[PDB]
Amino acid sequence: SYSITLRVYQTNRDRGYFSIVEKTVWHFANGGTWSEANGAHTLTQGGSGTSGVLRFLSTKGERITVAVGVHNYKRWCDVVTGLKPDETALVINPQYYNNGGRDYVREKQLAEYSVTSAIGTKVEVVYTVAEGNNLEANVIFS
Amino acid sequence: MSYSITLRVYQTNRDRGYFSIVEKTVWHFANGGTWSEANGAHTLTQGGSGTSGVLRFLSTKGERITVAVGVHNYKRWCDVVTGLKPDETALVINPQYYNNGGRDYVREKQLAEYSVTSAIGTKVEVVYTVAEGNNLEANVIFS
Amino acid sequence: MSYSITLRVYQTNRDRGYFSIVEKTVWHFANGGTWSEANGAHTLTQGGSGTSGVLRFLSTKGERITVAVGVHNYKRWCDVVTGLKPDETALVINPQYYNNGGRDYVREKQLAEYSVTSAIGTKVEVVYTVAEGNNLEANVIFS
Amino acid sequence: SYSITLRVYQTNRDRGYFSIVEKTVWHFANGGTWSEANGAHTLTQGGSGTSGVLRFLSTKGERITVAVGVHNYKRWCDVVTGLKPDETALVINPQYYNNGGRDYVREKQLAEYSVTSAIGTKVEVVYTVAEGNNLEANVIFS
């Protein structure tokens, strides 16, 4: 039913280079799958009400997760920084559900969100197509 | 002393369709870990023994299968689950191997190879070509 | 009306080692083209008939093979060259199919399938599962 | 003998998103091969005196090539923009050899080079490790 395509823009050499180290899919709304093409990561979801997380690890050992999904028919996103080596996407993704602590972030149904880690790395998520079933967003490191 | 499990996937029959990875999870025990890819091989680096990771595949015939790889008591193991539901993702499967989640048995068996055939008739075999040391390797085969 | 050739690679025997793509070229006739990848498949989009492209593979046993795919006279063709030299790259191979470069014959045969065995003993078969239309598909098989 | 590893930094959303559409290897110095890992593209060359080219196509139809290699034991690079659809890496790469027209660019043995296409896209190539056998460089779109 829904589709979120992501393209990553690493704009600052000083942050090191980030690469995806995990790709999870939440089991609500009939699950879904991750796919990639032309550098664009797509999360196809079986309906409104589930999500996916992409965890990145930079060349300087920084760990960050990007959470994207659809809540009550409106896209939502989140970015968590300064993650411990054992705080995986498998650990993070479930926290937005069944009162795991981040549920309220999801319900916000944000079309854009940005954060700067404690070590200075700014991560943004902005939806370039925030409406419809074929959503698109950019993930910007700076 | 961390651990690494490198996987190379072999697809042998156009019969069962073409499978592609649709998800990759890392368990949180043993200080976690990460998935990497290079020269067509998938590596799961683990911060030691006691954790694992899962690759979820989807064929062009709509089939969904998962491959679990990890280290139990400094001796590798593997597992394959077939005929998965669309909402039966790796987040549902990977945890079942721990906390009496349903598959702890399989993990404890510390297998260095495993095979099974989905009801749909697809066979998947995981075989560790390097089943000892801190750099284990294995091949994932579809047929 | 451009052309697309989608390739899915099947590796069947740990014997011949594991091959990985080490180069991808596009011939410049027919307004060129581009290589793309998605869901584990490789597509060569061509600005019409009269051009082709090459994938160069390298196994873990140091073997070097190339797969040529293109369209000749609105009818697909393919070719496989084995036992290539380290300096016998796809830039050396792809051009030989034109300008009386040495392999124009093969291209003209407009094959919808082809097989061969390198002296080292590795077999490679390219078979077009969709050999007609503007969206041709084929499987590259190693064994 | 030599190795050039590249990481791509697409810093400006306004340029569209670039993705590699061709990867060629020149046959001099015993050829070589292209490999990738953690978003880093590596060109392993059988010796000093050959090169490789990466051609990119953006979401807005822009075509550009990045040429990297080792000449007389010193790395070199080049970027050609505004390429026609039939001006492929296979067409471009050979032009730096046997007096193909770009030979002089190669002989410069540049450790850094930047150009701005006719449509405003600036492409830079800067070597972060310009010495040794394990060279490294960043490709920056802006």
Automatic annotation (TrEMBL), chains B, C:
InterPro entries: Cytolysin/lectin, Fruit_body_lectin_fun. It comes from the Eukaryota. This is Lectin.
